[PDB]
Amino acid sequence: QRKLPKHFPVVQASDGSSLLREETIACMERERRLPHNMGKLYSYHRPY
Amino acid sequence: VAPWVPPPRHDIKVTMPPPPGGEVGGRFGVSQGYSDRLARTPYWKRMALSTYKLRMMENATRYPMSEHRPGEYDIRYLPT
Amino acid sequence: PPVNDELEVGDPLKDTPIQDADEATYDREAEQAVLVDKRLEAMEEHFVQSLKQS
Amino acid sequence: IHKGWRTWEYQHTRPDPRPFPDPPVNDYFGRSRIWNPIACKLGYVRKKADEWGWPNKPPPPTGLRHSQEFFPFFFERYFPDAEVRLLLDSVLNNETKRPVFQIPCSMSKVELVNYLKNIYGIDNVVRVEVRNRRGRRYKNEVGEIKMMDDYKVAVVELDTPVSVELKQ
Amino acid sequence: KNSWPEWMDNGADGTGYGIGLHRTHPLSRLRGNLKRSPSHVPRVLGMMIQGVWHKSGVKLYFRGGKPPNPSVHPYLTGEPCPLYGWKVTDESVIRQFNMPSIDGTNFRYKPYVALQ
Amino acid sequence: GFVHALPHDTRDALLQEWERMHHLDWQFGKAVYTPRSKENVRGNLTWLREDRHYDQRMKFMQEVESGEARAKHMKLIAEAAGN
Amino acid sequence: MRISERAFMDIAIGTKAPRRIVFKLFPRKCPSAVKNFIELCSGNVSTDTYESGNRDKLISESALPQLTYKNSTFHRVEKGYLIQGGDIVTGRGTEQLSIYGGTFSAPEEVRASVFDKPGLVGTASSSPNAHGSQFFILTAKEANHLNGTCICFGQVADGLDVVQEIEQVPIDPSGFPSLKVSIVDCGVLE
Amino acid sequence: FKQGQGMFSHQLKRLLQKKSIHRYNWDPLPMYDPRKLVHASRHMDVETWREVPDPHWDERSYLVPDQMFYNIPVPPEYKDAYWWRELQARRVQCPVEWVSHRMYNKGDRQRYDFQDLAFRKKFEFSYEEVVKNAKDMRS
Amino acid sequence: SAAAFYEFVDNNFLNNKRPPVPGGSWTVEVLRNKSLADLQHIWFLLLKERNMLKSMKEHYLRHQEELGAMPAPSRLKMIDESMRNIKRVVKERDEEATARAVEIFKERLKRGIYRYPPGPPPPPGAHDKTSVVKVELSCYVEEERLRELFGRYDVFEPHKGIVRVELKLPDEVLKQKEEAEQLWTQYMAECSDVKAYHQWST
Amino acid sequence: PVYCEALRRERAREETLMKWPHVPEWKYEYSTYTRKHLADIVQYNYTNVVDY
Numbered sequence A: 001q002r003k004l005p006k007h008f009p010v011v012q013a014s015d016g017s018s019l020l021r022e023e024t025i026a027c028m029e030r031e032r033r034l035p036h037n038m039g040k041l042y043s044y045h046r047p048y
Numbered sequence B: 001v002a003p004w005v006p007p008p009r010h011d012i013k014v015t016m017p018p019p020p021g022g023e024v025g026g027r028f029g030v031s032q033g034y035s036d037r038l039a040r041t042p043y044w045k046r047m048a049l050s051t052y053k054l055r056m057m058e059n060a061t062r063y064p065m066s067e068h069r070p071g072e073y074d075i076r077y078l079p080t
Numbered sequence C: 001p002p003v004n005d006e007l008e009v010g011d012p013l014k015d016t017p018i019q020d021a022d023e024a025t026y027d028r029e030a031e032q033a034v035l036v037d038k039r040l041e042a043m044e045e046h047f048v049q050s051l052k053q054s
Numbered sequence D: 001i002h003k004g005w006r007t008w009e010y011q012h013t014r015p016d017p018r019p020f021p022d023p024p025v026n027d028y029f030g031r032s033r034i035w036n037p038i039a040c041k042l043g044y045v046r047k048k049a050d051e052w053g054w055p056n057k058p059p060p061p062t063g064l065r066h067s068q069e070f071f072p073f074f075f076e077r078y079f080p081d082a083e084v085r086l087l088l089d090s091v092l093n094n095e096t097k098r099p100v101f102q103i104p105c106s107m108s109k110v111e112l113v114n115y116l117k118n119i120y121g122i123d124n125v126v127r128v129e130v131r132n133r134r135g136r137r138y139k140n141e142v143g144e145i146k147m148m149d150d151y152k153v154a155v156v157e158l159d160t161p162v163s164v165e166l167k168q
Numbered sequence E: 001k002n003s004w005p006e007w008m009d010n011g012a013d014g015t016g017y018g019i020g021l022h023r024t025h026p027l028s029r030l031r032g033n034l035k036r037s038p039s040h041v042p043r044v045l046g047m048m049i050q051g052v053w054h055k056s057g058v059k060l061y062f063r064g065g066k067p068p069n070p071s072v073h074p075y076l077t078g079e080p081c082p083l084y085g086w087k088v089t090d091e092s093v094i095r096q097f098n099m100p101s102i103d104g105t106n107f108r109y110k111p112y113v114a115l116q
Numbered sequence F: 001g002f003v004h005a006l007p008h009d010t011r012d013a014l015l016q017e018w019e020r021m022h023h024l025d026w027q028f029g030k031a032v033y034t035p036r037s038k039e040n041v042r043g044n045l046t047w048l049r050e051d052r053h054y055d056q057r058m059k060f061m062q063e064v065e066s067g068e069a070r071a072k073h074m075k076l077i078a079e080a081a082g083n
Numbered sequence G: 001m002r003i004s005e006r007a008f009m010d011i012a013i014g015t016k017a018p019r020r021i022v023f024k025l026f027p028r029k030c031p032s033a034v035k036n037f038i039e040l041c042s043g044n045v046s047t048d049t050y051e052s053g054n055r056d057k058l059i060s061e062s063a064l065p066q067l068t069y070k071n072s073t074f075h076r077v078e079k080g081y082l083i084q085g086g087d088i089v090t091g092r093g094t095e096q097l098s099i100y101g102g103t104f105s106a107p108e109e110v111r112a113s114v115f116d117k118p119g120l121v122g123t124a125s126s127s128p129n130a131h132g133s134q135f136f137i138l139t140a141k142e143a144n145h146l147n148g149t150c151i152c153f154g155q156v157a158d159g160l161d162v163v164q165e166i167e168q169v170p171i172d173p174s175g176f177p178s179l180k181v182s183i184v185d186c187g188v189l190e
Numbered sequence H: 001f002k003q004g005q006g007m008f009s010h011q012l013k014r015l016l017q018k019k020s021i022h023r024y025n026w027d028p029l030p031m032y033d034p035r036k037l038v039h040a041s042r043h044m045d046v047e048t049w050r051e052v053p054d055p056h057w058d059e060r061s062y063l064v065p066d067q068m069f070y071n072i073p074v075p076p077e078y079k080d081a082y083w084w085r086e087l088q089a090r091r092v093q094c095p096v097e098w099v100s101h102r103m104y105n106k107g108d109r110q111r112y113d114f115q116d117l118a119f120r121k122k123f124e125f126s127y128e129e130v131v132k133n134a135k136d137m138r139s
Numbered sequence I: 001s002a003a004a005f006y007e008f009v010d011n012n013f014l015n016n017k018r019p020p021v022p023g024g025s026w027t028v029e030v031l032r033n034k035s036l037a038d039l040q041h042i043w044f045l046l047l048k049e050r051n052m053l054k055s056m057k058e059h060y061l062r063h064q065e066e067l068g069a070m071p072a073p074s075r076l077k078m079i080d081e082s083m084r085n086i087k088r089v090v091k092e093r094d095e096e097a098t099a100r101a102v103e104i105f106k107e108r109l110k111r112g113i114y115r116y117p118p119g120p121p122p123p124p125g126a127h128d129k130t131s132v133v134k135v136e137l138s139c140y141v142e143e144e145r146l147r148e149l150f151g152r153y154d155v156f157e158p159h160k161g162i163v164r165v166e167l168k169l170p171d172e173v174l175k176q177k178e179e180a181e182q183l184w185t186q187y188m189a190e191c192s193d194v195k196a197y198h199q200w201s202t
Numbered sequence J: 001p002v003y004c005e006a007l008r009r010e011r012a013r014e015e016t017l018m019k020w021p022h023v024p025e026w027k028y029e030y031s032t033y034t035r036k037h038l039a040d041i042v043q044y045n046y047t048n049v050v051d052y
């Protein structure tokens, strides 16, 4: 039986320690702002 | 927020729950006394700490009269 | 089957070799003593300040 | 109540208030965006998860919490976090006495000079000029409005003109 | 009254030198006028949207189009005095970045770890 | 220890001047405390009950010095052993 | 400096004549504390300023606490247990100073302290690691409860009777000795 | 001004909707300060002029709760002025409207404590307990 | 100097050569082996490198049209989690310290060696002046009975010289009681089952 | 009394720091308010990275 809803993200170490969860979340978030991979945008509204 | 929630009022006795608060003294309006010590303590640890002399002295039922508040009727027995 | 991948990627100047990275420097008791003592100092200090204002 | 409404025909559920509340989150990603001063539960609780384990671990003595050694202060003193980055177009093939840095907004003019002295070893800095520029906002191809982090533009005036050369 | 000193409500001098929002490192004895309480919530917004109109004809704090974050200001490090424009009452709040160097095997360390 | 139990109020000193300038100082549950040394002994109901108490403590120590206290306790122990 | 084993104090009770008590110090097991105590007994105040120096300082620099047990008191004296004094900044019993800073610390000296015999001198401190000028002379037979707490830096070689003399002073309701117990003069016997 | 087409007034309609931190600050007692009643009714030892540490003091003592101290011992005769912050400590620490759902359904009337407004779960068995408690009675 | 400015920029980008992707990052256990000084040093290496990379990323973002995208972007990810791991390790060590410290401090407190006015505390029995007496009993006695029986006869007070009376069961006999009552419940169950199974045949 | 009050001060602080603020462990509105549809998920986090 699940201890979190199926649609929740997995934010945790591989050990299961929640020690860093806020760093992990912060990282994921700054990453959703500006993904490092991101190729050329085809949008007319462009960061520069 | 409340560090150290105060214990139930009259809870001096081992195997039977305290009288309802507000009858001993306090805020009126519930008909049953409750204490988490007497509940959490396993039944066997209640019986282990007692005897069939003491048990029958605190099993005692004063029906309409109330002990702690003399001359009036006991509140639990009253409808409200 | 295994997940074998590009092993063709490497950056020697900027990469630490394994014999370098796996050297144990952690002696824990000494630095543990230092840490613990310098926690102790602050805890005591605030406690005696509490004693003061009491 | 000159006349009582018929309330007996309704089951008990609270209707939504017609001047309905808008959601508290801030949707405006523009220039004029306001930081919300109001503090919810979640802030403090996430603090409490971040600093010590609040759900599980027992809280440390107050004397520790209020001291320099307490972990978020300890880790900040001995493991600092700043992205101090340089606009290359200032230092590219032109000689320029005034390179231009992007800086986290929580740094002072003094802290930048300390940064450049002790880390990068840049020992001659006449002074620093500081702008606060709101982070770069862009829409992607689905039209998702995104905003890169806010930054501080520091024009850093040196003694010796500095260039970084590009081999063509 | 006000916990924060009175020079950040009306200025240290006639031209309103020291008024605005001031954030404090919360290890420091001195205190700022940034308070997130409900009763203080109007006036902090009152600074962020209006700013203040000083009688000297100059609008203090936010006069522009970009409202300042009171939350990410660098910490309040002192108090203004008329002689030397800013007295640093607390030096321990300025971050001194210090990095240990050329110790042991540290020179051989490199930012990434190689493969097998 | 008792002086520490009476309520202290934080207000002006001159309004305190004002209220016993009038008769207002004793009214609304306020009263003023002047430490005395000796009291009025007649019609003092605290006094009488506690000096009665002193009387029975005196006759109690008369009973103790005589030794019946010993005998009473010993016969209590005796009847406890007998039961 | 080992041969600095002795420092002495002249103790006066109120209007009584000063009587000498002579300490014996243990510099080897605890160098820091003893080094503190000795120099507090010596006390070079020998810097005499000038007219232009008065105009230059304009603070009167002798207005700081001058680091000498002279004109210092025994603020806390209790019967059968011990006698404590030596605060420099004020004679009222709080507020330590040391020669090094406000308060020093010597962790490896504190662990090694044992209080067993009477007439034993140790630093009066609030915590195991804040140590000032304040000292206490232990009059009781055995105090074994101060071990990881205090630091024992010396004993009373001469003038035990002085201790027992100033221990019998009555205590007024203020909590201090009713007769003012003052340290008239100090010196190191080198 | 909240009425405009501007974005400042657009934020203020939204940002002002989130709920502030709530703690129950239960009222100060400036004129009866429980922490100074430790020194009440104590005999003096006249050598040292300190208080006599009476061992009978600590069983007659009435523990007065508060927020920034854990509990404060007070002599019993003086307990009667503190009757309200005994009722604020035993109270649930919120507005009762937030926790009101404990009241309305039936199962939560029987399982929760309502004495002087403390909504707190009574002791209640797990299912395996219930099964093995009903099984060894052979019912 | 200007040499300090070159570390912000990419060396092989400067020479226009393709940047290579590094092998990997610092894992947790590799960092667990390292001491604190090493940790903060490689922290500063990661810091300088990270700053360099950020500058590059922003430069490519800056001219998107001419420059294209940033070559070998996967470095950022690496370096970030590298830092994360360092944090992890440090956190662990700190909390260990903290725990230790706590249990030392508290055992100081229960010794009671702190006093605000600088000095030693009074000795532990100087103030107590009380004596506790241990009584054994075969049966149970109500404590008021004990209080009247063991109360001082010469003391005139409602307590009669007795501070308090506390009754206990030793944990041996307590364990005995719970074991015995478990056996009793199983007994009732078994006699019930014996009666219930053999009722029909009989 | 001084020492005891200091001690009670300390543990009062740590318990009020333990027990406040009180946020429930779980309520159905977490799963209720965190459910978004597929269009909103795609329109929340999409990048060029997937298609490239």
Ligand SMILES: [Mg+2]
Pocket: H107, H108
């Ligand atoms: Mg339910």
